Subunit: 219 residues, 4 copies
């Protein structure tokens, strides 16, 4: 009837990958999401995908809050939706990654949320909660724990510069990053420093990944 | 109780043409619509009517998003409402047309939607999905499939010009149109090129129709 | 549980005059209103009161849309709330009036609504539907039927002037009025022409009433 | 299922202090609050906490309306949420206070609300209802009864000055205050007059408290 996330959709008997309506506790109008019903038994709610560089990710605060792109392709679900999902239960984060040779790796975090205790999560800058790494890609996110979300037009980072302008993305930047999955789609090895779709622990600072998917499931 | 569209209203036992409350999945406050309970067994939700040129259709982005006119007369329901309806199920589109001699034709499309997989359908420009033509008016819409919605103040078309300014309407313009049902109410044959209530496949580029109704029903 | 108006509140077993929560069809968050449980058997939803000139009624479009004052005193409920109430069923309007000698009269209208078929009732200017007068005050509203709502900062009247600026109120002005219950609280007989709390059919153009209440009940 | 406040959460069988979802009558999307399940049997909804001066409370109208800080630390829940809570039932207010020596006192008010009968509580300035004092801190709030909320950028006080600018806080200021719990975190005794976290009846005009919590429970 009113699944709160893709795990409710899966447990209701929908086994196919695709677009479904979900209805978080504090977002009762609901919205549509892409559900991954295959990974480790399925029930993952996607909030980010890169796969071909068809969508501009170098967007400002309003676009990162509200979301952009298409559920069937490259997209960012919107921090207001990711907040609505991650505050309603205890969620884990799965990150799938692919290089241009179709090599793959993943990073799993047993704890993930954005603006979890923020009265105004937008004003508070949708700060990241992340813990408990396992996987094959290595950890490129724990160093971002506690950081606010920074865009080219809204600086809340630990740099004297704007990390988002500098590394051409949008992220929970410190000074500045170990990961940059909202970076420019630079298509593999690049001379420029750390300004592509980067996961430093797997492919370092000068390799823009082919594919990323960031997705959540209740623990 | 809470019909999601005019077909739910009809199947609940309301057989009369008129104004009813509907409550789409992701628009739970609901809104009122004109229901056509006669055409091909009935249950059509109207989202556009022209009949007398009493309402200005040469409106900007905000008016096309939010809707204008009156449900009992000339109106545009609003792309935010048409998105809310067409994302909740698989809908067909019916287009009724009339000339100034009370001649009539129709176009049916077995698939229709706006911003179907858009995370932010407004920013994405409420792009048209349309397929599977049958009817008597000929096809004047399939060539618009995949196009974003363009207004005089928001250009997302495939022209070096603004198609909306140029053809004095608001539509899923390419370069520029085969149909222009939101065009100026020019009252039949006109010298100006393709800037009236046009359905090119039926009455060509220099004839502004008397009546149009665009309406949807689940398949 | 969820009364849609003061008549639902009365029929649920609440007999006392006062402030209650109501939940109109298309305003499901609900809001509070003053219920008149005495007049002609009770169940009237108040949307306007004048009684002492403590509240400024010479307000702009946003205040008339959103409402102002206090439910227990002088107030205007807001055209967005009056629209939400009058579109959910067929309502009658009761107008109670008092002069400074505690003389009283009433006007009843068997049909009343604002923006009844408007797709965007705000843009359409919350046009008045009113019919079927009876009472003791005489008819000072039927001549306003079909008129849009005009404020000092939003002119939709049939005057070359702004009727709202000119008669220091906010109303469904034609050219200009027979009634002006949102006029200045001028306290009885005044030299200035028709710019007080006027009901012309009862006390003419140069008498600002002590008390007005405008209230609705389903028929 | 849908507790309206922390007392519903407690009576549903949740005995632990912490963050819970509540769903007020006229705010059905709901929001999260910190519940005090210990004080005088428990079931208190927190709307204000000071404890360490980590959060700036010298904020404007929008921040006081919308809320700021974190539920687990220093925060202000937002006047739009406090209105939604205090209009749904008859609430009492509990104020806990601590000095820098870990000395403690409390003030209890048997009646508390903000914008209780306001049609537009924001425009009306979220005016305070408070009555019926008991406790150990003395009364520093009854003199504020009937006052609108004043911020540095929105003056509704009884001073020729802006009390909020002058006493570096945000409060239901008269001319100007006996309490200032949204004042600067000045850390105990200060030379400056009445511009810290003040409760004048307990620690006078020149002592900024260590800890304050303002919280409500239905009577
Ligand atoms: C890399 O993988 C791409 C995705 O292919 C799918 O996933 C693979 C892991 C595997 O399961 C495969 O069977 C799947 O089809 C490939 O693109 C796909 O290629 C197939 C033809 O084999 C084509 O029909 C699909 O449409 C296409 N998918 C997409 C999203 O483009 C890549 O294949 C290369 O590029 C293709 C466009 C095609 O030209 C093919 O001949 C190429 O090998 C895989 N390789 C690389 C280096 O990108
Ligand atoms: C064209 O059709 C208009 C709509 O008429 C209705 O639909 C028709 C298909 C048919 O079913 C008819 O019986 C319906 O009444 C006509 O306008 C209507 O005319 C009738 C009188 O016959 C009148 O009472 C209606 O109010 C009127 N409706 C509207 C919406 O105006 C046209 O009739 C012409 O114009 C009329 C205003 C009237 O003056 C009549 O004598 C005219 O023939 C039809 N013809 C044309 C060329 O427009
Ligand atoms: C006009 O009526 C006012 C309202 O009084 C109530 O309604 C009447 C129709 C009647 O049912 C009466 O019993 C009600 O009390 C009067 O004001 C009220 O006066 C009473 C004292 O009789 C007082 O206790 C109320 O608080 C007061 N109400 C309000 C809203 O002010 C008027 O009375 C005059 O003004 C009063 C303030 C008081 O001073 C009294 O002596 C005056 O006669 C009525 N007369 C006029 C000319 O205004
Ligand atoms: C004042 O009280 C602070 C809060 O302590 C808790 O509440 C007390 C009423 C009591 O129930 C106590 O058992 C609780 O722990 C103290 O801070 C706490 O101190 C403890 C060590 O005793 C420490 O483990 C806690 O993390 C700490 N809490 C917080 C919120 O900081 C104050 O203790 C002083 O400051 C501490 C940081 C620590 O250094 C301690 O040695 C100090 O005595 C209490 N005293 C004062 C003057 O502030
Ligand atoms: C992309 C980025 O922030 N890179 C590095 C950071 O990882 C490194 O630890 C630091 C050394 O001081 O220099 C930063 O520029
Ligand atoms: C209204 C409109 O866009 N008309 C035509 C289009 O249908 C035609 O195919 C093209 C030829 O290049 O010229 C455009 O102006
Ligand atoms: C307040 C107002 O509009 N008054 C009158 C109107 O009632 C009258 O019929 C008309 C005569 O032309 O003159 C208007 O000014
Ligand atoms: C902080 C504040 O408003 N303090 C005092 C007030 O309590 C006092 O009664 C008044 C004397 O006139 O002077 C004000 O400044
Ligand atoms: Ca910076
Ligand atoms: Ca163009
Ligand atoms: Ca005018
Ligand atoms: Ca002042």
């Amino acid at each position: 009837s009113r699944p709160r996330d893709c795990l409710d959709v899966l447990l209701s008997g929908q086994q196919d990958d695709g677009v479904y309506s979900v209805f978080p506790t504090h977002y009762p109008a609901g919205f549509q999401v892409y559900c991954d019903m295959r990974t480790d038994g399925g029930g993952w709610t996607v909030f980010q995908r890169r796969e071909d560089g068809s969508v501009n990710f170098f967007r400002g605060w309003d676009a990162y809050r509200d979301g952009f792109g298409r559920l069937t392709g490259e997209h960012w679900l919107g921090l207001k939706r990711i907040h609505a999902l991650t505050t309603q239960a205890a969620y884990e984060l799965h990150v799938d990654l692919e290089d241009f040779e179709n090599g793959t790796a993943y990073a799993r975090y047993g704890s993930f949320g954005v603006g979890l205790f923020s009265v105004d999560p937008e004003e508070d800058g949708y700060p990241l909660t992340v813990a408990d790494y396992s996987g094959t890609a290595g950890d490129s996110l724990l160093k971002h724990s506690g950081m606010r979300f920074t865009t080219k037009d809204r600086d809340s980072d630990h740099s004297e510069n704007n990390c988002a302008a500098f590394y051409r993305g949008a992220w929970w930047y410190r000074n500045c990053h170990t990961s940059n999955l909202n970076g420019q789609y630079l298509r593999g090895a690049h001379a420029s420093y750390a300004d592509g779709v980067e996961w430093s622990s797997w492919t370092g600072w000068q390799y823009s990944l082919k594919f990323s998917e960031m997705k959540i499931r209740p623990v």
